[model samples]
Target: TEQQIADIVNRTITPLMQEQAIPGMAVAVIYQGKPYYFTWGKADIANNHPVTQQTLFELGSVSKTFNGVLGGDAIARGEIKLSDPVTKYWPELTGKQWQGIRLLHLATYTAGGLPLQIPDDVRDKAALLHFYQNWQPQWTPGAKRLYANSSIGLFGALAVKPSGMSYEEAMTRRVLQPLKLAHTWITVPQNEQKDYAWGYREGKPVHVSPGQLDAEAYGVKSSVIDMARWVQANMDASHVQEKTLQQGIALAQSRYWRIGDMYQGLGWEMLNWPLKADSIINGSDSKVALAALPAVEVNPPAPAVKASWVHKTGSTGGFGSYVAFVPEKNLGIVMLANKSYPNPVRVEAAWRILEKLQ
Candidate 1:
């Protein structure tokens, strides 16, 4: 059985690595509730270091899902409500133009329009506050769907406000630790530095550069060993062990918005299953993310659906990542690499791996 798993991973992953010139990669899968793991090449080529399940790689925007789950965790604790206005927490924006926005609008990226990145000029806390205070939206909230870091980044920042801890501490205290994700971190600790993978950009080692809202938006670092478990926890939330956090995990997967064939579930973009690879890849194209599209809200929102291909993509300066799972089939996959490659390549490779497992 293990041999078969290796054959599947090798045939599916090895060629991708070679073509992309990826320095190292780690993949893990949970099939029928049992787990299998695989590793390839080197984590640090110059040092001859090998890739392991412990090697921490940047999670990129895939960290947004953590922000999504944190929202659910906060709601489960009765700290806030989706209906609450943004002004409720940050009254600093009491008379601002973005005042009409709500927590739900922020969570689902239906909060009018926001730039993909914070303005280049907004550097520090006070500057960021001023930016939000003076912001203007081209469309009305919930009128158009535009995927942007600003929306979910604010969602994450405000979601944890009632707790009085910093974003990292709130995430660690409420979400990560409760879910048994011991090795995942918004800021990788000094002790784990040795296990950090060297991300290669054109053969030069690099990693994500920190920016405002970086911690909540795109700053997670983790290993496939832990990432695969995160996938499992989402599959059913049965393994999370904490009752309240498990409910939060379930709420995190609810379908809140849909555009064309794509569905937005907090951080995941989903579609009906029994489909092909091209559907997944095309929906993930940057055009959809770069601009707003007419979106249909799910009225009161739909509970997580079965027979769904739920997935998210994350890419930072030097790292690229994808995580996908189908709960009905008891299947999931994690692909993490030290090189930032195209999304089509990542989705197709994972699709092939899924085919082999299926």
Candidate 2:
């Protein structure tokens, strides 16, 4: 059985990177409560640094899910209520457009209207508030859904206001500190610059893509080693050991918006990808992506019939990462790369490994 799993992983992954010129990748597969892992090539090619169990990869938008967990934790601590309005905690944020929007709405990415990336002109928190305050809504609050990085990023920052600490400090105090996730960093400290993996494009240091940046919206960097800790926390929901944090993860993983065939959750995205091609493919709902990219509403009256999945993907200009878990199976995975490729190739390759794992 061990050989079979190894066979599947080795046979499926080795060639993909080789053929695609991926350079290197780090993968973690946790099955039946054990972690099976593989790494190829180097984390820093120029320096000849081999990828290690400790190398940290940029988690990209996967950071948002962490934000979701932190928010949920705050609530469990009685620090804030999920239903509270953005204005309630951040008084300066109170405005007409933000009216009717709640903390939950921001996390769900369903707070109404068009979402835009923060412009370069707004450099400070005061300016950021003004940017959001004056921004117009595209849809009536909660009427339609749009997945925007600025929206979610602002939400995460908002959480810090009521959280009684700076966002970075609060995150460490609450989650990372407790989890002992050393490699994860919102902003890389000066000393680690030499070891940090550089984002590459056609083989050179480059800024990450706008879309990838949106996922985190603000700038944050993390490593695969730290992400593994995040994976463990998600699987057991004990990193924070707070009821709100656990409930928030439960809420986020659940569906939030219903816009035809696609579904959106707090900080995560769900897909009903075509199982045929999907089952073959390594990513989310294939057909839904092919047919209509509809957004699903989170509140399902039946509750019993709600399809369950907690997934998030991040792709910067030169890097991409994917993290997912099936609670029913109590299984999860986190994969990261410094190079971004087309066709979900890396994720596809990862799924193949996950398929035969347990």
Candidate 3:
């Protein structure tokens, strides 16, 4: 059985790297509360450095999962209520569009019609305010799920607004430190630069842009060891000693909305388990732009009594990463790469490994 699992890893990931031209990747798998780590190709191809458990990769929108955790913590602490109007947090954001838009709308990406990105012209505070004041909704709030960075970015800011700390500060104090994530960072510290893997696309190095909102939306870097710990926490919060920390993880994974085929939690996509590998792979490959997708709001599901899977896919200009897990199985997988790969490959690889695992 162990041999079958090993064969799956070699068979699935080896050709994937060759076919996709992935420069390097680090993978960590969790089984029954234990961690297994692997590396492939090169971390720095020009220098011939191999990827390792400690090699850091930009998490892209996987960072949103952390923001989701912070939102759960914020709710638990009574710092904010999901049903509160967004204007209650940022009164400067005003319009007929804002009339009944709740924090839950933003948290769930159902805030009527924010786009995938904020327009470039509206880069600064005064400009952003000007844009919102006149902005009108394409659909009524809570009518659809449109995956917008603006929605979650604003949710991140609002989560911490009542804390009187910056987003990073609040996240560190509330989530990161409590979880004892030493190497996870909003910005890689100078001392840890050696571990940071630079991303490449078309053989040229590239990176995600830095901006106030972008930082919250997509600005975390971490290694396999650190991410494995995160997966463990999500798998079983008993891995975390604090009761509030456990509650936060539960809240983060609670279902908030349902598209016909997909269920969305705070920032994670959830699915009923024993899910077909091809189904997961196909879903990722055929993902549509947020504005084109249709969805309906739903009440949160009661806590799971058995295995269920939650996952997220993330990519910047050059890097691609994926995370998925089944808590009841005590199983999880994380893949990070220097080159951007298709989401189908990420999902397929994880699914193949999980097939052998079960």
Candidate 4:
């Protein structure tokens, strides 16, 4: 019943909110392919406004998932190849430092050891090209997983090229439209600004500022309702009308590499299902995000049809987000918040809710 689901979410998340002073959250669950939404606290605490299913929350790194789908979809259509090197898309990137790195390296965060953020000084694509021109690998590609924005963001640039549009437009046309994500945006339009949640950082309002590949990286804003739909499509793309995109969703969710017990999808992360909360917390710990670790390829790769706890965490300075689902169970959850809380807290809260539901 709806009541049971609501109680589980509230019971699991409310105490964390109280302890962390988080301003607001919108959590949605897709149970057996049907969606349910619940909200708590205030979207704008100062205005006493409550969060709604339609309230747009900055998705931060969750945007990368869409990039993954775009690239994977392009791959499905033969517009791009994962084995192709990044320099294949941009001739300027041709250099000794750039060799031996394929587009798959970027999607998996195994492209050497790119930084968590693109340098603030590199404001344009020309500068972005220059950064790659001199970039050096800290470790061999596919040997280490270093969670990064630049690597994935750069791949987003290459991924969107086949469509002949900028990253946002390309993604909008290639992924968002096909997925029917109407309320999602790399840049929220003026008409919908009213419902954009006021993200609170340290009790003051803030938002992500744009820089190089920001749109390709931590630059999506969406509601839990729409995000839930995206989550469902991942669980099963049979309902996604677009042919290649349906495959893209599956490819994006498929396990491509293994770094310890953790498996890397195109953008999402995964662990064998029936996992303990500690597994998620340890994998998502700051150390993993800050440092690179050895990785082993999933030769031939595992298909998305397998049972797994697939998930990703996203954050801007003022916002935090997490989404996960079990495709075999046909169950998933998306939690969006206006405050940039710790990743472990978000993972633990979602895990508790998932455990209760499971």
Candidate 5:
């Protein structure tokens, strides 16, 4: 007997890409413990090359969720607590509004003070710590929430601080190594540079400018194959043999914010989806404004699905990536592009595809 899944995929993707325009993209779909993948366009448009499963691209913010697994694992190990103050990991945060902020609040994007991107002066860990020492939030620690890179990234740094390792090592030791993701690294390792994919801005080659920030902020080099493991981990936390399913669900689906219509899960953003037509709507295509960014600044509240989907989107100078999965179904999807694009749309596209098969 034949599965005929490949034939179904070809039909679905070809029409969806009737006259598409993008440098290169890769899509991976996982269902019932089996995984399938597809790639279209060029990996390096300037170099006249085709994209593949092994080409390394920045996971951008998607890296945070990968980093989140570490933070969650840290909690289970008692290395850090979600309610632990930021001062616990980086004690210099005392005597400021940031003093009351907790590791979980930062990880969940509810810290309310840190901005989306930290300033150039706050590049390295020491500088960032200094910035935190003097920084004050526009809103109280948990009053009004806006997604901030400093909050998420620093939390990433703090989560691994207890392990006495670099952000790269923390992820590898806690999650990637367990899953056998050999090609993923926070910063591009020297030996792997040649295979690194250059991100594109306005259709031109651009190297990422790391002015003043740690890799935890948004710096990781990975591939479709490497990220596939990430999608799997999110769908079912059993990949790492976590202590309790309750904790795993909390890590994956806990609400940190009431962003109009959606809830800000640990490292992912979710939708309280509404009905589409006949079938239920759960893709990015059916999105409204949430607290995140570039989605819909002012969106109407959604109704059909209440807190059922969890997703994350990422991008670097030349690359864009997305991951979405419904924990209940244990169905997940991962997509990577060698260019930058806005949120909701990227992950929305990934969810649309997964909705059809599973």
Candidate 6:
């Protein structure tokens, strides 16, 4: 059985790397609460280092989902309410447009019309506050879902306020340490820097610089081994012994809203997999990514449906990552690459791996 699975991973993953020219990657599958690992290509091309379970790679927006975990934990502890106004935490971020926005709107990416990235000029906390204070929306709050880092960053910053801890502290104390995600980090410790993967874009080494609020949005760096732990925890929160973290997983996985075919669940996306593979692929495909915008709705009518699986994809200019799991099925995956890859490739590769998992 192990041979069969290994054959499937090689057949599916090897060609993908050759075709995509992926410089380095690590993939892990969690089944029945254990992980099977694989690695390929070079972690450092000039130095000729191969990727290993311990090699660190940027998770990009996959990092955003951690904020969702934190938010869920806060909610479980009664530290914050989803319906609370954004102004409740940061009054300086005030405007007439802000009146209709709630913390949930920020978490779900329905917070009016924030852009994909904050303007370069707004590079720090004071500027971020000023931008929000004078911000104007092209659409009313909850009218449309526009994917953006600003929404989650805003939500993450406010989500931790009631605990009287900074974002980094709250995440470490509440989620990371408790879950024993030892190799997952927002800021790489000096001692661990050697394991950090050197990312490349267009054959040139590049390092993603932190934006004003990138930490809560797209700033996580983690190794495949630790991410395997993350996937296992996601598949079944009981894998984590802490009660609050367990509660947080449930909240993070719960569907809050839908926009067209995309189901929003905190920082992750929910899909009925197999049935929704086509919808998921199309939504994730960059070629047609913008097509989902016009059909976006706050709480569009929906028929009752069974919840099955959750997934999230992330990419920066130099790296890409995707994670998915089915709780009832007890299966999940973690895929990370140092060379940037498209979402379609990530999704297709996961499909291949899932087939073998089933």
What are the clash counts of all predictions, listed in order? 0, 27, 0, 0, 7, 0
User: Candidate 5 on 226-332: residue-level lDDT in tens?
Assistant: 77777776666554654632244346555555654566666766654332322222223323323433222211223213236667777777877877766666667
Pitting candidate 2 against candidate 6, the one with the higher lDDT is 6
Better of 1 and 2 by TM-score: 1
Q: Candidate 1's error at 327, in angstroms? A: 0.6
Stretches of model 1 off by over 4 angstroms after superposition = none
When 3 and 5 are scored with lDDT, the better candidate is 3
lDDT leader = 4
TM-score of 6: 0.94
The worst-scoring run of ten residues by lDDT in candidate 1 lies at: 282-291
lDDT of 2 by residue, 229-325 (tens): 6776675664456566666555555555665544566566554532333432443433432222334445551121123344677666667778866
Q: Estimate each model's TM-score.
A: 0.97, 0.84, 0.94, 0.97, 0.82, 0.94
Q: Using TM-score as the measure, what is the rank order of every candidate, best first?
A: 4, 1, 3, 6, 2, 5
lDDT of 6 by residue, 1-358 (tens): 6777778778888998898888998898876667889999888886778898899999998998898999989988988888888888888766678986889888887777787778878877888888887777878777777788888889999999999999999999899999898999999999988788888898988767978878899999999999988888876776577787788887887767766666777787777755556676677887555332642443432321234667889988788999988776777889999888889888888877886777
Q: What TM-score does candidate 2 get on C-alpha atoms?
A: 0.84
Candidate 1: C-alpha lDDT: 0.85
Candidate 2, after superposition: displacement of residue 213 in Å? 9.8
Every candidate's lDDT: 0.85, 0.64, 0.81, 0.86, 0.66, 0.82
lDDT of 3 by residue, 1-358 (tens): 4565556678888888898888888888887778888788777866667788888888988989898888888888788888999999989886667989888988888887787777866778887778767777788887788887888888988888988999998888788898888888887788987777878989987767776577678888888888988988877886676666677788888878777667777787788887777667877873563444667666655553346788888898888999989987988988888999888878978888877787
Question: What ranges in model 3 sit over 4 Å off?
Answer: 1-4, 46-48, 286-291
- CA shift at 126, candidate 4, in angstroms? 2.0
